[PDB]
Amino acid sequence: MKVRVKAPCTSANLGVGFDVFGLCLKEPYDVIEVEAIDDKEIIIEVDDKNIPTDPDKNVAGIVAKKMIDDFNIGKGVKITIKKGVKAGSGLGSSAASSAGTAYAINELFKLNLDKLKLVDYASYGELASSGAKHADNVAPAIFGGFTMVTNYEPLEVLHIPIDFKLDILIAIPNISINTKEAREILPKAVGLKDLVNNVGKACGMVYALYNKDKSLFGRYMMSDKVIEPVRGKLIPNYFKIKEEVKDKVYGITISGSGPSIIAFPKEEFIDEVENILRDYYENTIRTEVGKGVEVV
Amino acid sequence: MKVRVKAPCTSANLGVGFDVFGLCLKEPYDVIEVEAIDDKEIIIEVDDKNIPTDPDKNVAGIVAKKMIDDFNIGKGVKITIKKGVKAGSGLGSSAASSAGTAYAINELFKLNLDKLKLVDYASYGELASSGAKHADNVAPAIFGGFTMVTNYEPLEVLHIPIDFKLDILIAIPNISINTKEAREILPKAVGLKDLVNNVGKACGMVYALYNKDKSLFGRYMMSDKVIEPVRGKLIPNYFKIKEEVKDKVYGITISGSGPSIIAFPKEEFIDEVENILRDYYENTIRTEVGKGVEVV
Numbered sequence: 001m002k003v004r005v006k007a008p009c010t011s012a013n014l015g016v017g018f019d020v021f022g023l024c025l026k027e028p029y030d031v032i033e034v035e036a037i038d039d040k041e042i043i044i045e046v047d048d049k050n051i052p053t054d055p056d057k058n059v060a061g062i063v064a065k066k067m068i069d070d071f072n073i074g075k076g077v078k079i080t081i082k083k084g085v086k087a088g089s090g091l092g093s094s095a096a097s098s099a100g101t102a103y104a105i106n107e108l109f110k111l112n113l114d115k116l117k118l119v120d121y122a123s124y125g126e127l128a129s130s131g132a133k134h135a136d137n138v139a140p141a142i143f144g145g146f147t148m149v150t151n152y153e154p155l156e157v158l159h160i161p162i163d164f165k166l167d168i169l170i171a172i173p174n175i176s177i178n179t180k181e182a183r184e185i186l187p188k189a190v191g192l193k194d195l196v197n198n199v200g201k202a203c204g205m206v207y208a209l210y211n212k213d214k215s216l217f218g219r220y221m222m223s224d225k226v227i228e229p230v231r232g233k234l235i236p237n238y239f240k241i242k243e244e245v246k247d248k249v250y251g252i253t254i255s256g257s258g259p260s261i262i263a264f265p266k267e268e269f270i271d272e273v274e275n276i277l278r279d280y281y282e283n284t285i286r287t288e289v290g291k292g293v294e295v296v
Numbered sequence: 297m298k299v300r301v302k303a304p305c306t307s308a309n310l311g312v313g314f315d316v317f318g319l320c321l322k323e324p325y326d327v328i329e330v331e332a333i334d335d336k337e338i339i340i341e342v343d344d345k346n347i348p349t350d351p352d353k354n355v356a357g358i359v360a361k362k363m364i365d366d367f368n369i370g371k372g373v374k375i376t377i378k379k380g381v382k383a384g385s386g387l388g389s390s391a392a393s394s395a396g397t398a399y400a401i402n403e404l405f406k407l408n409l410d411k412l413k414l415v416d417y418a419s420y421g422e423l424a425s426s427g428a429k430h431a432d433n434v435a436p437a438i439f440g441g442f443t444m445v446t447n448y449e450p451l452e453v454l455h456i457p458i459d460f461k462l463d464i465l466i467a468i469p470n471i472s473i474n475t476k477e478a479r480e481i482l483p484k485a486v487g488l489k490d491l492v493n494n495v496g497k498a499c500g501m502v503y504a505l506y507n508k509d510k511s512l513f514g515r516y517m518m519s520d521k522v523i524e525p526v527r528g529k530l531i532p533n534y535f536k537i538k539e540e541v542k543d544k545v546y547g548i549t550i551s552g553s554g555p556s557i558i559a560f561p562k563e564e565f566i567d568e569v570e571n572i573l574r575d576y577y578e579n580t581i582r583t584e585v586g587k588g589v590e591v592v
């Protein structure tokens with residue numbers, strides 16, 4: 001009763017898709033192992049003793065429990081957690097654990113849940129650990145590709161497979177941003193003009209995915225005037241880099257609530273763009289769209 | 297030396313697609329004839345006396361001048377118009393004349409302009425006549441099917457052809473709402489949550505069209521809380537009607553600024569739905585998605 005699997009990072013928001021859009025990455029990823037023990041305890045082994053190891057406080061511990069209850073495994077569990085990336089950087093670090101955790105269980109013991117259900121319980125973890133469902137990082141972690149959380153209370157997720165090559169460059173500033181503090185600057189109200197702008201550009205991005213038009217997808221992604229102009233201020237040199245790689249990327253925007261940045265470099269400039277990101281920030285990752293948590 | 301065209305009515309907004317979405321109807325439509333005449337003058341005749349004949353006021357005369365001017369055409373034109381529906385009903389009556397004229401001029405004088413440019417020209421009629429360059433009704437009138445105006449300067453239109461069966465029922469109350477009236481009902485600001493809600497649902501409608509899922513398309517269409525709740529109050533029996541056809545349609549909402557109502561009846565209830573609308577509004581018409589202006 002052992003399961004080893006990869007739970008990938010994800011990038012939520014993608015500019016105009018704030019709180020709806022999610023893109024699953026191939027890397028980084030949390031490598032998680034969950035062997036089924038006999039006793040009734042929840043044991044957490046997580047490198048970087050910065051991640052709460054107490055089952056009720058750790059995200060994977062929360063998902064883990066609530067799922068055994070509902071499926072009455074009457075067993076406890078030990079969790080081997082190899083962190084793919086630092087929390088508070090905007091790459092769905094936590095979401096990776098939740099979805100990784102939930103997918104494990106289901107794969108393991110003959111359970112035959114729905115990817116949507118897994119996304120559901122997994123949210124329990126981002127919710128029971130942050131007070132919000134946030135299926136937007138969890139949904140792509142599970143479905144892979146591109147996802148849209150179009151409804152909560154109940155939960156609905158629309159999935160669009162990315163069948164073409166989409167190169168992705170990620171830069172991770174050695175800075176931390178309080179996900180919460182950057183909520184209050186987030187306006188409580190918006191003008192009709194922005195409703196119209198964001199609805200149009202986001203819809204245009206769905207159209208771009210169906211037409212495999214990366215240029216159109218990336219350009220509309222960078223059209224938000226509501227959240228990005230505010231959140232961007234906290235990211236050192238973000239606006240300057242955007243302008244600098246302007247003609248060398250299909251698009252570049254903040255990943256989740258930041259400070260991590262996600263860019264879609266043009267084939268002809270992947271090396272150069274990756275270098276520019278390395279000079280400003282120091283940590284850069286070259287990846288592409290992933291297919292979500294899969295048994296390793 | 298003349299051309300005659302059928303220019304369709306159109307339905308904009310479609311609930312959560314305010315100022316973005318547009319659906320072309322097959323009927324009603326304007327029948328417009330344009331004849332190249334020798335004196336450099338613009339003569340306009342119409343069968344609706346509540347509509348101007350002054351070339352600088354009739355939307356058709358405004359579009360024709362702008363094009364004749366830009367292309368330095370030597371001739372003048374006689375425009376004869378048979379109206380499909382009254383203005384002020386939310387069915388894009390003015391747009392039908394504007395799009396129809398731009399399309400007819402382009403045919404008569406062999407300008408070979410692409411559809412996007414004909415929508416841009418048709419847009420002057422909408423502006424020069426109603427103060428704002430709006431293209432969400434002229435876009436579907438020129439392109440047919442479903443359109444998204446995703447940028448206004450420069451103008452950008454994304455077209456999604458509808459190749460599956462989509463029955464439409466239109467109820468036209470004997471009331472009118474002009475452009476100043478339309479603006480009056482509009483909220484000053486929108487909450488962040490509504491923005492997120494409309495972005496998600498509008499994006500789901502696009503996903504629905506690519507997946508030919510009429511149930512999903514209609515359901516998300518009925519999700520707006522920003523404008524429909526206020527606008528519906530202006531239409532006698534609207535909420536009551538919506539409730540009455542509740543499980544017999546894929547969706548029902550207001551057409552454009554209203555007061556007309558657009559419904560997408562489920563195939564097994566089309567006659568029953570048409571009769572219910574008809575009990576409330578005599579001027580009810582059955583139609584389907586149109587292909588845009590066409591030479592007749």
Ligand SMILES: Nc1ncnc2c1ncn2[C@@H]1O[C@H](COP(=O)(O)OP(=O)(O)O)[C@@H](O)[C@H]1O
Nearest residue numbers: 051058059060087088090091092093094095097
């Ligand atoms: N398995 C886990 N992986 C990562 N972070 C966890 C986990 N379990 C609990 N946490 C804690 O929850 C908090 C989550 O921060 P968070 O805003 O969710 O990061 P992120 O925005 O990358 O998803 C952190 O303080 C972290 O220590």
Ligand SMILES: Nc1ncnc2c1ncn2[C@@H]1O[C@H](COP(=O)(O)OP(=O)(O)O)[C@@H](O)[C@H]1O
Nearest residue numbers: 347353354355356383384388389390391393475
């Ligand atoms: N060819 C035309 N067809 C329809 N309306 C026109 C035309 N030329 C000018 N107008 C005027 O412009 C105004 C447009 O009202 P409007 O809100 O644009 O109707 P609609 O919303 O159906 O397009 C009316 O007062 C109308 O008389």
